[PDB]
Amino acid sequence: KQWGITPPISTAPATEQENALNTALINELKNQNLFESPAESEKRVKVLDELQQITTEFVKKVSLAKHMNEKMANEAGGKIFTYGSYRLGVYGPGSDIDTLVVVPKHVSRDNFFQDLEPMLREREEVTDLAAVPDAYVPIIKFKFLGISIDLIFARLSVPRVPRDLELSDNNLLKGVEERCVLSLNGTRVTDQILQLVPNRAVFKHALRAIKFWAQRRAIYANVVGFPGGVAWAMMVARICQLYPNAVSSVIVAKFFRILHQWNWPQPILLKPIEDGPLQVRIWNPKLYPSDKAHRMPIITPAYPSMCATHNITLSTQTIILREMVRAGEIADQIMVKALPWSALFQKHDFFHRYKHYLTITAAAKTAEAQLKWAGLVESKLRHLVTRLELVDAIALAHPFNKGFDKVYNCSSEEEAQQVASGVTLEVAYESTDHEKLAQIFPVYTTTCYIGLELEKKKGRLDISWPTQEFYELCKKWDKYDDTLMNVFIKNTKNTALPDEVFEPGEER
C-alpha cells in the first residue's frame, strides 16, 4: 500500500543499528519522565467513563425537561469524545484532556451551561469548575479527581446521538452551527491522523520525541505563532508516510531535514483535500488571499480542510527553520553514534542569542485576576511580534511565552500600584508558579519576553507607538479592571536580564 499522497522515499526496513538507536531513543524518553504511571492512565479512563455517564444523565434530563416521553429520553443518547494529545496517546504527566460532549438536536448550548455545569458542580470529584460562557467556543474547565478536563460543546441535527456514533460521516455536519462544526473538527482530525500513518506505534514514539524537542526549545505554542500540538503531529505523521517501514529514530532524523528543505509555501497534506455537502470555504490559496498568505501551511485532513499554522509569522517561520537545521545536525550526529540522544533535547538559548529584549509583564493585585489577566496579555503577544516586524530597524522578533511568576511584598498600597505600573524600586519579591490558592500587599506578575534582531546596515530603535498600541489592545478587554490589572513594557539589554531566566549552571 502507498501511504499519503506521495510515493514513499524509502520502503527499506530498519537496519540493525537503527533498531539499537531506536531503543536508546525510547530509553532517553523514559529517563526524562515523559510517561505517566499506568495508575494515572487507568485514572483518566475512569474519569472519561464518569463524564460519559454524566453525559447520558445530562441529555436525558434536558429531554424530560422539554416534555419528551420516557422512551425517547432513554434513546436520546449523548457521547463523550476526546481529541488533542490524549486521543493521539502522546501526553505528559498532568496534561489536560481535550474532551468533546456531543448531544442530539433538542439539547441547546444554554443547557450546556444551565444544566450540565450545575451537574458537574454537584459532583464531589469535581473541583476548580470555571465556565467561560462568553468565549467564541463554549468551554467548561474543571478537575475531575485531580485530572484537568477541557470540555467543549457541540450540538448535532440528529434526533439522537448513539453510543456507537462515529464522527467520520461528513453528513453529520449538516444543519449544525458553524461554531459546532469546528468543535467536531478537533476529534475528526485526530481520528484521521491515526488512520493515515502506516505504523501507529512508530508515529506515537516519533511524535513524543519531536514534541519534547519543540517544548524544550520553546517552539511549541500556537498562541505566539509557533506550531501547536496538532500541527507538530501532522508534521510527524507526514514523515511516517514517507518512510512507512522505518522505526522512530529514523523518522526523527529525517524529520528535521525534510521539513527545513521543503518547498514552502507548498502545504503539508496527509491525504487529498476532500469536498463536502456544506457550502463553506475550504483552504485554497488560489481562491482566497488569506489562504495565500499562510507561510508554512499544515492542512488538516478532515473536511473542511483548514490551515493549522495560519498564525505563523515571518519571525516564527525563520525560527522554526533555524531550529530544524540545528536539530538536523544534532540528529545526524546521533545516528552515527557521535552524540547521545540527550543532546537533541538541550534546552533553548533564547536568553543568549540576542542583545535586545522586550520585557512584557502583566500585573494584578489579586491572584484570581492575575490568572485571567496574564492570559489576555499572552494572547496579544503574537500581534506585538507582527507589529514589531513593521519597524524598519527590526528584522525579527522572537516571542518567548514561558511566563516568569513573581510576587512582590510591598508596604504601602501606593507601592502596590507603583510596582504594578513598572517601577520595581527595591521591593523584595519571591518566585512562584501558576499553582494558586483560589502588612501583606501582594502584586502578582507574569513576565514574557521578545528577543529583537536589528537590521544590519547597508548604506533609531523607536518602539514607542507599537508599545502604546499594545497597551490599548490589552486594555480593550471586556474584563479589564483598571483597579487591579496593569501591563507595562521595558527595553531590556542582554546584560540586564534577570537571574530568573537562567538555571544554576548557565552564564550571562
Numbering used by the authors: 13 to 450, 475 to 495, 500 to 548
What's the paper's own text on this?
The S. pombe orthologue of the human PAXT connection, Mtl1-Red1 Core (MTREC), is an eleven-subunit complex that targets cryptic unstable transcripts (CUTs) to the nuclear RNA exosome for degradation. It encompasses the canonical poly(A) polymerase Pla1, responsible for polyadenylation of nascent RNA transcripts as part of the cleavage and polyadenylation factor (CPF/CPSF). We report crystal structures of Pla1 in its apo form and in complex with Red1. Taken together, our data reveal the molecular details of recruitment of Pla1 by Red1 which leads to hyperadenylation of CUTs, serving as a signal for exosome-mediated target degradation.
We expressed, purified and performed crystallisation trials with the full-length (Pla1FL) and a C-terminal truncation (Pla1Δ14) of Pla1. Both constructs readily crystallised under a variety of conditions within 2–4 days. A comparison of our crystal structures of Pla1FL and Pla1Δ14 shows that the individual domains have undergone significant movements. An alignment based on the middle domains illustrates that the N-terminal has a modest rotation of 2.95° with a 1.13 Å displacement, while the C-terminal RRM domain has a more pronounced rotation of 9.8° and 2.26 Å displacement.
